[PDB]
Design a protein around this ligand. Structure first.
Ligand SMILES: O=N[O-]
Ligand SMILES: O=N[O-]
Ligand SMILES: O=N[O-]
Ligand SMILES: O=N[O-]
Ligand SMILES: O=N[O-]
Ligand SMILES: O=N[O-]
Ligand SMILES: O=N[O-]
Ligand SMILES: O=N[O-]
Ligand SMILES: O=N[O-]
Ligand SMILES: O=N[O-]
Ligand SMILES: O=N[O-]
Ligand SMILES: O=N[O-]
Ligand SMILES: O=N[O-]
Ligand SMILES: O=N[O-]
Ligand SMILES: O=N[O-]
Ligand SMILES: [Cu+2]
Ligand SMILES: [Cu+2]
Ligand SMILES: [Cu+2]
Ligand SMILES: [Cu+2]
Ligand SMILES: [Cu+2]
Ligand SMILES: [Cu+2]
Lengths: 332, 332, 332
């Protein structure tokens, strides 16, 4: 009887940050209430000033990470304001039935809906828009995110012992297919609808023009680099709603990795690089052992360094010469 | 001494259906006899009427699923009628030696051969044609299928407890590379041989023009949707002889998944999406919990919804509001 | 205190062979000293005579396999002779900190450096060049290899029992992106630097022109086929520094496979084909059961048979008719 369960309202935060939550559940099952507003907006995605009409949940690419526990209910109020031009919906890969909710959440501009579903399987899962007949256009315009369903007793290692993270970040990776003219220059459009047939042709090449973290080339660099300290335990949730990726922490490892994101399985240990299939979220746990700059990349290095799938960590603390040292510095 | 073993003749059925078999072996090891006839035929693969010269085992794309038990012998009579134009052979990834049988089964039109091999490893495995110098042309013209070698005691979960399926379906996924003229229109040819150099050039782009289930866009929809009932346990065998895929049941999960298809390994649990590498068969087990339409897709959504890699399940039964419900239907 | 540990100097050998080592450690932890010389050289990569300016560690593509044990120290003297034209460095995915060593090993032509790192995680790992701003160009010009860190007690199966190999081979798989003119012909350049902007444009297509084992189409065939005997236990280490691959032994299996290459995890059993993600090394163990020719391929068969990712094993010994036999040889 759901009416007797506690309700808790969560205010979401912008990726790559994650809303406050408890790893080990401090309450019984709850109805966890979220609200998201759909925003179609112009986004500049590279250093050249290339602009697309992005389709977003809550104004960001990716959409925000939602965090609940196994056997909580998720109640999502989804709002499509009348300033938008398209029909949207939402499909949760965490959910059972009705196309993940897509069949029940079709909202025209000026409409809203509220969906509830039970989070029966623990793991990180993709959510994305999926309107009939226009599914990849919405997804590849940025309309995807992820949801994490923690076990009620938190994460465990391969021997069943607790794993506790100190920090968590969410990296959404996005493949974009920006249409090009005859000579290879990117086209611009006044409205999302203008782009539609050119977008289909661009997608059918299967060759993205940009692959980015957090919605733009260089988004997770500089003042927006991810941070940690030596000794900190960090969980990085990574999603890709449409196309395979292979994350790698340059200078580190994935100590414990759930490449396909489902926590009832034991983690893979000591990974250099792992494959997250398109339409999946995964999670990697690492304890930092050295300070400095790290690069976190899709290790198709062309995708990383030419097309945009690279971010940075900046790590503070003490250098350990036992792990690595320069014996003879570069010299003639 | 093989001459003292029982022989049993199996009549194959057209995908996505699977011939009758027992999950737990009710006899000792047997010689299991199959016959396949090669048929080169014209196939219409999309709604626009695009036609290719397909190369098939038993008239279908994919070829039929063969089912035996571990340590059975498979004896295959392979017939290449004189109405065909090409040399063909067969390579079983389940088999040990002679290029999987390919070296021993080269049949010109008007020839036949009989191969026997012992099924020593349990799992689902690809089989495909592989003639010297023309391997990817035959495979990507549809000349592939799969074989399932069940353990003698059936399937088991990750704790070693029995898993019994109620229904089984076989989804063969096919990448096609239809040659195009200067403007992007598909070419037509009178005979398979006419297409050969244009086919090589089309394949070398690494970009399929169509990716389909059961040989055509929309093949597993409408009257040919897959069916199940709420509460039924369904095993879906999925193969891809040449190119990676990432299956996903929209509105469901893979409860138990052998992504690379080999049953001595524990299944992965609770998968949203899984990667089947090209040249592999995998298997996913799901118990339906909600009625309605489900879409089963390759979750590169461009590959699914633009290029053809999508099918439907239609599921009968009772709706469970505890798992999902619309709290407020879409409204202004 | 490192100064009290034994030092041992290893002389590397050319792939696909591997330097002598012990599987089970016969000494305590050591400092293992390697020297590598960088060589930029012209390489002919196909039967048509296509030439690239390759960037190599020790004159080969791939670079040589280094073998140590867990908790050894690796000390690498890296030499960039003044006959080269470019800055180079090295990044070990086995190492912790400083971008895998890349930040500490930048050598202009005429310089050398010595790096030491502790091998704290067992597995096979990629190493590659990664200079700031030119990472994929160096990697996709051949500047990558692998390092194997064995557990001190050797390899184990999924039940923790020892696995001992009789022979080991290293297959480096390389994606090349040779620039093309308007009509599709490959361009030639006097120096590596001439090619740079054309190389960037070629890489951004994400479509390799060649995918090869051991640096050229057909490198592991003929007199250079890999050899084994029936009954021999063979470990094949396979790396791909940039792009996914899916190895398959035609006529065999991977009996025990570490697809993502990390030995603290149990192997996957009985694999037909396995996925090694780009930026990863994996390892497969097989016991040969039949003599004859085997093909070892990337099982995207277009990549294998059209673009070059195929090699051969030639296996001596006795044929076993119980496993496979021709019952009726091909006939009219
Ligand atoms: O846009 N409806 O609240
Ligand atoms: O190429 N990944 O869908
Ligand atoms: O092929 N996915 O990067
Ligand atoms: O080791 N980074 O590509
Ligand atoms: O999906 N389990 O990593
Ligand atoms: O075509 N031979 O039966
Ligand atoms: O892209 N899969 O071979
Ligand atoms: O890249 N395989 O869809
Ligand atoms: O959730 N289906 O793409
Ligand atoms: O290959 N075992 O899923
Ligand atoms: O090139 N320095 O030895
Ligand atoms: O397509 N593999 O990076
Ligand atoms: O997509 N890698 O072959
Ligand atoms: O079975 N070899 O492609
Ligand atoms: O990475 N372990 O196969
Ligand atoms: Cu939308
Ligand atoms: Cu989806
Ligand atoms: Cu054939
Ligand atoms: Cu094969
Ligand atoms: Cu270099
Ligand atoms: Cu790397």
């Amino acid at each position: 009887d759901i009416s007797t369960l506690p309700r808790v309202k969560v205010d979401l935060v912008k990726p790559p940050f994650v809303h406050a939550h408890d790893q080990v559940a401090k309450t019984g099952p709850r109805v966890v209430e979220f609200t998201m507003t759909i925003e179609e907006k112009k986004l500049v995605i590279d250093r050249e000033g290339t602009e697309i009409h992005a389709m977003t949940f809550n104004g960001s690419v990716p959409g925000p990470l939602m965090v609940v526990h196994e056997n909580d209910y998720v109640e999502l109020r989804l709002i499509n304001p009348d300033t938008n031009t398209l029909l949207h919906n939402i499909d949760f890969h965490a959910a059972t039935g009705a196309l993940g909710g897509g069949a029940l959440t079709q909202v025209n501009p000026g409409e809203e809906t509220t969906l509830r579903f039970k989070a029966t399987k623990p793991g990180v899962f993709v959510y994305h828009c999926a309107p009939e007949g226009m599914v990849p256009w919405h997804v590849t315009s940025g309309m995807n995110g992820a949801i994490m369903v923690l076990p009620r007793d938190g994460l465990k290692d391969e021997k069943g012992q607790p794993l506790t993270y100190d920090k968590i970040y969410y990296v959404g990776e996005q493949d974009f297919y920006v249409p090009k003219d005859e000579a290879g220059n990117y086209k611009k459009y006044e409205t999302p609808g203008e782009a539609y047939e050119d977008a289909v042709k661009a997608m059918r090449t299967l060759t993205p023009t940009h692959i980015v973290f957090n919605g733009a080339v260089g988004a997770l660099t500089g003042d927006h680099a991810l941070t940690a300290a030596v000794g900190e335990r960090v969980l990085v949730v990574h999603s890709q709603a449409n196309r395979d990726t292979r994350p790698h922490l340059i200078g580190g490892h994935g100590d414990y990795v759930w490449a396909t994101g489902k926590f009832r399985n034991p983690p893979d240990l000591d990974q250099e690089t792992w494959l997250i299939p398109g339409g999946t979220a995964g999670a990697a746990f690492y304890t930092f052992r050295q300070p400095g700059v790290y690069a976190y990349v899709n290790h198709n290095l062309i995708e990383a360094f030419e097309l945009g799938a690279a971010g940075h960590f900046k790590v503070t603390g003490e250098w350990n010469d036992d792990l690595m040292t320069s014996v003879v510095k570069p010299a003639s």
